[PDB]
Amino acid sequence: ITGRPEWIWLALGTALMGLGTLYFLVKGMGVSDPDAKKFYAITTLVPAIAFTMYLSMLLGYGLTMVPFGGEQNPIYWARYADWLFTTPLLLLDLALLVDADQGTILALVGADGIMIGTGLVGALTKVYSYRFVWWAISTAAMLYILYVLFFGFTSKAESMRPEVASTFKVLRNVTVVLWSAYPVVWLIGSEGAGIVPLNIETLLFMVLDVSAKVGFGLILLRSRAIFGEAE
Amino acid sequence: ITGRPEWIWLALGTALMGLGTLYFLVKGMGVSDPDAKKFYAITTLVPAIAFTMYLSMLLGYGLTMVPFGGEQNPIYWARYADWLFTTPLLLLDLALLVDADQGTILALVGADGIMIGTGLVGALTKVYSYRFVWWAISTAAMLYILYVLFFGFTSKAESMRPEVASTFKVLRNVTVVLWSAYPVVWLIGSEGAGIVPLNIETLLFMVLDVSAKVGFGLILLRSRAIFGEAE
Amino acid sequence: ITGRPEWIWLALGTALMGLGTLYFLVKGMGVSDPDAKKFYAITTLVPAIAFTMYLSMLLGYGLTMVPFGGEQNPIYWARYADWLFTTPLLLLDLALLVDADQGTILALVGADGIMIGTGLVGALTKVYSYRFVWWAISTAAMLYILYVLFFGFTSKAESMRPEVASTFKVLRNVTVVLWSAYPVVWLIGSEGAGIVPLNIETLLFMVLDVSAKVGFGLILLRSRAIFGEAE
Ligand SMILES: CC(C)CCC[C@@H](C)CCC[C@@H](C)CCC[C@@H](C)CCOC[C@@H](CO)OCC[C@H](C)CCC[C@H](C)CCC[C@H](C)CCCC(C)C
Ligand SMILES: CC(C)CCC[C@@H](C)CCC[C@@H](C)CCC[C@@H](C)CCOC[C@@H](CO)OCC[C@H](C)CCC[C@H](C)CCC[C@H](C)CCCC(C)C
Ligand SMILES: CC(C)CCC[C@@H](C)CCC[C@@H](C)CCC[C@@H](C)CCOC[C@@H](CO)OCC[C@H](C)CCC[C@H](C)CCC[C@H](C)CCCC(C)C
Ligand SMILES: *C/C=C(C)/C=C/C=C(C)/C=C/C1=C(C)CCCC1(C)C
Ligand SMILES: *C/C=C(C)/C=C/C=C(C)/C=C/C1=C(C)CCCC1(C)C
Ligand SMILES: *C/C=C(C)/C=C/C=C(C)/C=C/C1=C(C)CCCC1(C)C
Ligand SMILES: CCCCCCCCCCCCCCC
Ligand SMILES: CCCCCCCCCCCCCC
Ligand SMILES: CCCCCCCCCCCCCC
Ligand SMILES: CCCCCCCCCCCCCC
Ligand SMILES: CCCCCCCCCCCCC
Ligand SMILES: CCCCCCCCCCCCC
Ligand SMILES: CCCCCCCCCCCCC
Ligand SMILES: CCCCCCCCCCC
Ligand SMILES: CCCCCCCCCCC
Ligand SMILES: CCCCCCCCCCC
Ligand SMILES: CCCCCCCCCCC
Ligand SMILES: CCCCCCCCCCC
Ligand SMILES: CCCCCCCCCCC
Ligand SMILES: CCCCCCCCCC
Ligand SMILES: CCCCCCCCCC
Ligand SMILES: CCCCCCCCCC
Ligand SMILES: CCCCCCCCC
Ligand SMILES: CCCCCCCCC
Ligand SMILES: CCCCCCCCC
Ligand SMILES: CCCCCCCC
Ligand SMILES: CCCCCCCC
Ligand SMILES: CCCCCCCC
Ligand SMILES: CCCCCCCC
Ligand SMILES: CCCCCCCC
Ligand SMILES: CCCCCCCC
Ligand SMILES: CCCCCCCC
Ligand SMILES: CCCCCCCC
Ligand SMILES: CCCCCCCC
Ligand SMILES: CCCCCCC
C-alpha cells in the first residue's frame, strides 16, 4: 500500500468520505419529511460510493496499467466507477431542488453518462493521440451539462421559493467551478499530457472530490430548501 | 460441464428458475390491473435474470479463476451480475407493497448496490485478508437494508390495508432470514474461509436463490395485496 | 484504422450518428413543452450514444478477439454497450407515446436488457455451439418485446389521440421490421454461422442502426404527437 507515493491522499480521501458518509447518515436520522428524505438519501449515497472506490484505490484493486507512450501507465479506473454513479446523483440533487422537468433530468443524466463513459474510454485508450479525442468529446458533454445548469435551471429557480433559489445558486456555482477543474487535471496529469505527477494529481482529485461531495452536501443538507414548505 | 461436481446444482438451479419464470409469465397473462402488472413485471423478471445467470454458470461462462492463498480459486462471478439486478427488484416489490417514499426506495436500492458491488470486489480481490474487509462493508450495507425493512417499513405497513400489511410482514420475514444466510455462506465457502467446499456452497446458494426468488414470488403473486382495491 | 475493410462503414456510421445527433439537438432548442422535451431528450441521446460507440469501433477500442472454431474472431463488443442503453431508450419513446403503464414499461425494459445481455454473452462465448443457445434465449426475449408492442400497445394507442395512434403505428412497424433483422444478421454473420463476411455484416448493421435511430427519430420528432394537446 505504502509503496505508492499517492497512498497518503487515497487514505485521506477514504477517511474523509467515510466520515462524511457517517455524518450525513446520523444527521438524516431525525428526518420524516418526504422531500428531505430524498435529498438525504441522494446526498448520503454520494460519499458512501466514493468511500468504497477510494478504498478500492487505496488497496490497489481500482488500479490498472495501461500501455501508452511506450510505458506502463498507472490508471486508477475506480474513479470512473465512482463518478458514473455519483455525478448523476449530484445532478439529481440540483435537478430536484429546482423541480426540473423529466426531459431535462434525462438530458442531464444522459449527458453525464456520456461524459464519464467517454472519460473512461479515454483513460483506457492505448493510442496516445486518441486519448485526447475522447477527452474532447467528454468535455463537450460537460459543457452541455454546464449550459443546462445555467440556461435551463437558473431561470427556473427564480420562479421558485427564495430559499431554493438561493441554495441552488450557491450549489450551481460550486458545481460549475469544481467540475470544470476535473478535465484540466486529467489533461495535465497522468491520464493525459503527464506534466503533473500522479501523486500530485491524486491530491488534486481528492481535494476536488471531497469538496464536490462532502462540501456540496454540507451546504445542501444545512439548507431549509430541502424541506417542503410546512407549518 | 459435468467435470465440475457442482454442475448438478447449477443445472437444477437453472431448471427451477426457468420453470419459475414460465409459471409467473403464464400466471400474469390474465392481469389487467395496473398495480398487479407492476408486481408481475418485477417478480417475473427476477427468476428470468437468475435463469440466464445460472445458465451462464452451468455452461462455464460465469466462472473465473482468482489467485489467492497461493491457489487458483474458482469464483462464480455471474452470481453478482444476477444479484446486482435481482436484489433491487426484490426490494422494489417490498417497497411498492408498502408505498414507500421515493427517498427510502433510493436509500434501499443504493445500499443494495453497494452491498452487491462490494461483495463483487471482495470476490475478485487477490489479497486474501482484504476480501474480508469488503465482506464487512457489504455486510454493513446489508444490515442497513435490514434495519430499514424493519424500522422504516413495518410501521408504514400497519397504516395500510390489512392484506398488504400481512403479506408484507410474511415477505419481510422471509427476506430477512434468507438474505442473512448469504454472507454466512460466502464467509465459510470458497470465496472466504474455504471451510465448506464449492459443491456444497453451490447447493446452499441454489436453495437460497430459489427460495428467495421463486418462493418469495409464489407468496407475493398469490396475494390479494398486489391488486388495487376495486369493486 | 484503414487496415480493417469494414472501417468505411464504421466511419460512415460515426458520421451519420454524429450528424443525426447535432440535427436533433439543434431542432430541440426551440422546445419548451414538457412532453416534447422528454421525447427530444430520449431521441437525441440515442444517436449520441451510438456516435460514441461507432467511434470506439472505428478507432479499434470497441473490438476484441474471441477464440472459437479454432480461429481468432473479431467481435465488436461495443455494439452491445450501445444497444444496452439505446434500445431501452427507443422502447421508452414508444411506451411514452402511448402512455404505457409502469408495469409494462418495466417488462419491456427488463426483457430488452435480457435480450442485449444474452446477446453479449453469446457474442463472447468460446464454445461455438453454446453461442446459439444464447442467440435463442435473446431472440425469445425479442419476441416477447415484439408481442407486447403489438398485443399490449396497439390497442392502447387506439384509445388515445389520433396523432399519437398514427405515429405510434408507423414507429411500431418500423421498429418491428428493423429490429427483427438484427438476430438474422448476427446469426449469419461473424458472430454466428460466418456465412456473411464482417465487412458486409458491418454495412448491414450500419444501415439498420441509422434507420432504427436517426430514421426513427426523424419520424418521431416531426410528429405533433410528441406535444401535449395545447391551445
Ligand atoms: C443513459 C446514459 C447512461 C448513457 C451512457 C453513455 C455511455 C453509452 C457512454 C459510453 C459507455 C461505454 C464506453 C462503457 C464502456 C465500458 C468499458 C470501458 C469497460 C471496460 O472494457 C474495455 C476493454 C478493456 O479496455 O475490455 C476488453 C474487452 C472486453 C471483452 C469487454 C466486453 C464487455 C463490455 C464492456 C460489455 C459492455 C457493457 C456496458 C458497457 C456496461 C456499461 C459500463 C459503464 C462504464 C457505462
Ligand atoms: C446507486 C447504486 C447503483 C450505487 C452502486 C454502488 C457501487 C458504487 C458499488 C461499487 C461498484 C463497483 C465496485 C463495480 C466494480 C465492477 C468491477 C468489479 C468489474 C470488474 O473489473 C475489475 C477488474 C478485475 O478484477 O478489472 C480489471 C481492470 C479493468 C481495466 C476494469 C476497467 C473497467 C471498469 C470496471 C469500469 C467501471 C464501470 C462500472 C464499475 C460499471 C458498474 C458494474 C457493476 C458491478 C456495478
Ligand atoms: C432489468 C434489466 C437491466 C436486467 C438486465 C438483464 C441482464 C441480467 C442480462 C445479463 C447481463 C449479463 C450477462 C452481463 C454480463 C457482462 C459481461 C459480459 C461483461 C464481460 O465479462 C465477461 C468475461 C469475459 O468474457 O469477463 C471475464 C471475467 C471477469 C472477472 C468478469 C467479472 C466482472 C463482472 C462482469 C461483473 C458483473 C457486472 C454486471 C454484469 C454489469 C452489467 C453489464 C451489462 C452488460 C448488463
Ligand atoms: C464526485 C466526483 C465528481 C463531481 C467528478 C466529476 C468529474 C468530471 C466533471 C469529469 C470530467 C472529465 C472530462 C470533462 C473530460 C476528461 C475526463 C473527465 C472524466 C475527468
Ligand atoms: C436472489 C438472490 C439474492 C436474494 C441474493 C442476496 C444476496 C445477498 C444478501 C448477499 C450478501 C453478501 C454480503 C452481505 C457480504 C458477503 C457477500 C454477499 C454479496 C454474499
Ligand atoms: C439502435 C440499435 C438497435 C435498435 C439494435 C437492436 C438490436 C437487436 C434487436 C438485437 C437482437 C439480437 C437478438 C434478438 C439475438 C441475437 C443477438 C442480437 C443482440 C443481435
Ligand atoms: C447458514 C448455513 C450455514 C451452515 C452450512 C452448514 C453446511 C454443513 C455441511 C457440512 C460441511 C462440509 C464439510 C465437510 C466437507
Ligand atoms: C449509467 C448509470 C446511470 C444511473 C445513475 C444512477 C442515478 C440515476 C438517477 C435517475 C434520475 C431519474 C430520471 C427520471
Ligand atoms: C446498479 C443497478 C441498479 C438498478 C437496478 C434495477 C432496479 C432499479 C429499481 C428502481 C427503483 C425506482 C427508484 C425510484
Ligand atoms: C441495463 C441498462 C438499463 C437502463 C437503460 C436506461 C433506460 C431506462 C429507462 C427507464 C424507463 C423508466 C421505467 C419506469
Ligand atoms: C458554455 C456554457 C457556459 C457555462 C459553462 C462554463 C464553461 C467553463 C469552461 C470549463 C473549461 C473546461 C476545460
Ligand atoms: C440491525 C437491524 C436489525 C434487523 C437485522 C437483523 C440482523 C441479522 C444479522 C445477520 C447476520 C449477518 C452475518
Ligand atoms: C410473436 C409476436 C408477433 C409479432 C412478432 C413478429 C415476429 C417476427 C419474427 C422475427 C424473426 C426473428 C428471427
Ligand atoms: C499526440 C497529441 C495529438 C493531438 C490530438 C489532439 C486532439 C484533440 C481533439 C480536439 C478537437
Ligand atoms: C455539444 C455541445 C453543446 C453545448 C452548446 C449547447 C447547444 C444548445 C443546446 C440547447 C439545449
Ligand atoms: C487473513 C484474515 C485476516 C483478518 C481480516 C478480518 C477483517 C474483517 C474486518 C471486520 C472489521
Ligand atoms: C452502517 C450501518 C448502519 C446500520 C445502523 C442504522 C443507522 C441508523 C440509520 C437510520 C436511517
Ligand atoms: C454447432 C451448432 C450446434 C447447434 C446448436 C443450435 C442451438 C440452437 C438452440 C435453439 C433451441
Ligand atoms: C418467452 C417468449 C414469450 C412470447 C409469447 C408471449 C407469452 C405471453 C405473454 C403475455 C404477457
Ligand atoms: C472512520 C474512519 C475511517 C477511516 C478508514 C480509512 C482510513 C485509512 C486508514 C489507513
Ligand atoms: C423448461 C426446462 C428448462 C431446463 C433447462 C435447463 C436445465 C439444464 C438441463 C441440463
Ligand atoms: C460532423 C462530422 C462528424 C464526422 C466525424 C466522424 C467521421 C469519421 C471521419 C474519419
Ligand atoms: C466548496 C467548499 C465547500 C465548503 C463547505 C463548508 C460547509 C459549511 C456549511
Ligand atoms: C421460503 C419458502 C417459500 C415457500 C413458498 C411456498 C409458496 C406456496 C404458496
Ligand atoms: C426506416 C426509414 C426511415 C425513413 C426516415 C425518413 C424521415 C423523413 C421524415
Ligand atoms: C460522525 C458522527 C456525527 C455525530 C453527530 C453529529 C451531530 C448530528
Ligand atoms: C454566490 C455563491 C458563491 C459561491 C462560490 C463558491 C466558489 C467555490
Ligand atoms: C465559471 C468559472 C469556472 C472556473 C473554472 C476554474 C477551473 C479550474
Ligand atoms: C409452467 C406452465 C404453467 C401452466 C399454467 C399454470 C396455471 C396458471
Ligand atoms: C409470520 C411470518 C412467518 C414467516 C417465516 C418464514 C421463515 C422462512
Ligand atoms: C431474524 C432471524 C435471522 C436469522 C438468520 C439466519 C441466518 C442463517
Ligand atoms: C446540423 C445542423 C442543423 C441546422 C439547422 C436545421 C434546421 C433546424
Ligand atoms: C403504415 C406504416 C408503414 C410503415 C412501414 C415501414 C417499413 C420500413
Ligand atoms: C412483421 C414483418 C417482419 C419482417 C422481418 C424482416 C426481417 C429481415
Ligand atoms: C432452455 C435452454 C437450456 C440450455 C441448456 C443447454 C445445456
Side-chain angles (χ1 to χ4, degrees):
Chain A
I1 273 50
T2 56
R4 293 168 275 141
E6 70 270 16
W7 81 266
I8 182 60
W9 312 124
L10 295 177
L12 235 183
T14 301
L16 293 172
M17 296 298 187
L19 272 299
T21 295
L22 292 175
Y23 180 73
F24 296 154
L25 185 73
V26 170
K27 193 177 182 302
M29 291 191 57
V31 176
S32 58
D33 177 73
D35 281 335
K37 288 200 274 184
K38 293 168 185 53
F39 289 107
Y40 268 97
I42 296 177
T43 304
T44 303
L45 274 170
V46 165
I49 292 161
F51 166 80
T52 65
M53 291 297 91
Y54 264 86
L55 180 62
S56 82
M57 290 189 282
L58 177 67
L59 304 179
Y61 184 88
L63 174 70
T64 189
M65 297 293 165
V66 180
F68 61 86
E71 307 165 16
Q72 293 290 346
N73 302 274
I75 298 292
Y76 282 103
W77 60 263
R79 302 196 187 279
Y80 306 92
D82 173 339
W83 300 346
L84 179 63
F85 297 107
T86 58
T87 54
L89 283 175
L90 286 166
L91 292 178
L92 197 56
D93 264 341
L94 294 180
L96 288 188
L97 207 49
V98 299
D99 195 28
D101 64 271
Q102 293 186 358
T104 302
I105 300 184
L106 201 83
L108 277 172
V109 172
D112 191 282
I114 289 168
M115 181 179 72
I116 301 306
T118 57
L120 177 55
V121 167
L124 298 176
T125 279
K126 298 174 183 181
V127 177
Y128 186 63
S129 71
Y130 293 166
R131 300 176 64 87
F132 303 102
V133 174
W134 292 109
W135 178 91
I137 294 161
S138 177
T139 293
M142 191 192 69
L143 286 179
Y144 176 81
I145 291 162
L146 298 189
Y147 172 83
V148 172
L149 290 186
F150 268 100
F151 300 97
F153 271 12
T154 290
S155 297
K156 176 63 186 299
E158 303 178 18
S159 61
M160 312 254 301
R161 296 148 55 182
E163 59 274 13
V164 306
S166 50
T167 296
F168 171 74
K169 181 180 65 184
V170 175
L171 293 178
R172 175 201 73 192
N173 291 346
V174 164
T175 297
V176 175
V177 170
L178 288 178
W179 284 36
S180 296
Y182 285 81
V184 182
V185 173
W186 193 105
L187 190 65
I188 66 173
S190 60
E191 291 89 356
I195 305 161
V196 169
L198 180 57
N199 70 308
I200 303 311
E201 170 188 345
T202 302
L203 167 61
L204 294 175
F205 274 140
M206 189 256 282
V207 172
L208 294 168
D209 283 344
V210 174
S211 302
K213 295 184 163 69
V214 182
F216 181 102
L218 281 172
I219 296 165
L220 180 62
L221 293 182
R222 280 177 63 264
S223 186
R224 270 144 269 261
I226 64 178
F227 288 91
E229 232 184 343
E231 195 73 43
Chain B
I1 273 50
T2 56
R4 293 168 275 141
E6 70 270 16
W7 81 266
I8 182 60
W9 312 124
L10 295 177
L12 235 183
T14 301
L16 293 172
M17 296 298 187
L19 272 299
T21 295
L22 292 175
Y23 180 73
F24 296 154
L25 185 73
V26 170
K27 193 177 182 302
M29 291 191 57
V31 176
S32 58
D33 177 73
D35 281 335
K37 288 200 274 184
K38 293 168 185 53
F39 289 107
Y40 268 97
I42 296 177
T43 304
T44 303
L45 274 170
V46 165
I49 292 161
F51 166 80
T52 65
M53 291 297 91
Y54 264 86
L55 180 62
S56 82
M57 290 189 282
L58 177 67
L59 304 179
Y61 184 88
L63 174 70
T64 189
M65 297 293 165
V66 180
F68 61 86
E71 307 165 16
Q72 293 290 346
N73 302 274
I75 298 292
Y76 282 103
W77 60 263
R79 302 196 187 279
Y80 306 92
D82 173 339
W83 300 346
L84 179 63
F85 297 107
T86 58
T87 54
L89 283 175
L90 286 166
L91 292 178
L92 197 56
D93 264 341
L94 294 180
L96 288 188
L97 207 49
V98 299
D99 195 28
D101 64 271
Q102 293 186 358
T104 302
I105 300 184
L106 201 83
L108 277 172
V109 172
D112 191 282
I114 289 168
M115 181 179 72
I116 301 306
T118 57
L120 177 55
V121 167
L124 298 176
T125 279
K126 298 174 183 181
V127 177
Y128 186 63
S129 71
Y130 293 166
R131 300 176 64 87
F132 303 102
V133 174
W134 292 109
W135 178 91
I137 293 161
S138 177
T139 293
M142 191 192 69
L143 286 179
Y144 176 81
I145 291 162
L146 298 189
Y147 172 83
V148 172
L149 290 186
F150 268 100
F151 300 97
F153 271 12
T154 290
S155 297
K156 176 63 186 299
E158 303 178 18
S159 61
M160 312 254 301
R161 296 148 55 182
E163 59 274 13
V164 306
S166 50
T167 296
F168 171 74
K169 181 180 65 184
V170 175
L171 293 178
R172 175 201 73 192
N173 291 346
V174 164
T175 297
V176 175
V177 170
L178 288 178
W179 284 36
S180 296
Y182 285 81
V184 182
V185 173
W186 193 105
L187 190 65
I188 66 173
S190 60
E191 291 89 356
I195 305 161
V196 169
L198 180 57
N199 70 308
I200 303 311
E201 170 188 345
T202 302
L203 167 61
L204 294 175
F205 274 140
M206 189 256 282
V207 172
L208 294 168
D209 283 344
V210 174
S211 302
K213 295 184 163 69
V214 182
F216 181 102
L218 281 172
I219 296 165
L220 180 62
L221 293 182
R222 280 177 63 264
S223 186
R224 270 144 269 261
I226 64 178
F227 288 91
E229 232 184 343
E231 195 73 43
Chain C
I1 273 50
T2 56
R4 293 168 275 141
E6 70 270 16
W7 81 266
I8 182 60
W9 312 124
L10 295 177
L12 235 183
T14 301
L16 293 172
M17 296 298 187
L19 272 299
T21 295
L22 292 175
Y23 180 73
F24 296 154
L25 185 73
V26 170
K27 193 177 182 302
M29 291 191 57
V31 176
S32 58
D33 177 73
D35 281 335
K37 288 200 274 184
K38 293 168 185 53
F39 289 107
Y40 268 97
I42 296 177
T43 304
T44 303
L45 274 170
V46 165
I49 292 161
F51 166 80
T52 65
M53 291 297 91
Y54 264 86
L55 180 62
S56 82
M57 290 189 282
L58 177 67
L59 304 179
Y61 184 88
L63 174 70
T64 189
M65 297 293 165
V66 180
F68 61 86
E71 307 165 16
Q72 293 290 346
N73 302 274
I75 298 292
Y76 282 103
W77 60 263
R79 302 196 187 279
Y80 306 92
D82 173 339
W83 300 346
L84 179 63
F85 297 107
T86 58
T87 54
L89 283 175
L90 286 166
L91 292 178
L92 197 56
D93 264 341
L94 294 180
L96 288 188
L97 207 49
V98 299
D99 195 28
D101 64 271
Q102 293 186 358
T104 302
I105 300 184
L106 201 83
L108 277 172
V109 172
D112 191 282
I114 289 168
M115 181 179 72
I116 301 306
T118 57
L120 177 55
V121 167
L124 298 176
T125 279
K126 298 174 183 181
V127 177
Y128 186 63
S129 71
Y130 293 166
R131 300 176 64 87
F132 303 102
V133 174
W134 292 109
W135 178 91
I137 294 161
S138 177
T139 293
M142 191 192 69
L143 286 179
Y144 176 81
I145 291 162
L146 298 189
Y147 172 83
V148 172
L149 290 186
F150 268 100
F151 300 97
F153 271 12
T154 290
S155 297
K156 176 63 186 299
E158 303 178 18
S159 61
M160 312 254 301
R161 296 148 55 182
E163 59 274 13
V164 306
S166 50
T167 296
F168 171 74
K169 181 180 65 184
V170 175
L171 293 178
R172 175 201 73 192
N173 291 346
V174 164
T175 297
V176 175
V177 170
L178 288 178
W179 284 36
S180 296
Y182 285 81
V184 182
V185 173
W186 193 105
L187 190 65
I188 66 173
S190 60
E191 291 89 356
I195 305 161
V196 169
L198 180 57
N199 70 308
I200 303 311
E201 170 188 345
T202 302
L203 167 61
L204 294 175
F205 274 140
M206 189 256 282
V207 172
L208 294 168
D209 283 344
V210 174
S211 302
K213 295 184 163 69
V214 182
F216 181 102
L218 281 172
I219 296 165
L220 180 62
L221 293 182
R222 280 177 63 264
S223 186
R224 270 144 269 261
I226 64 178
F227 288 91
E229 232 184 343
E231 195 73 43

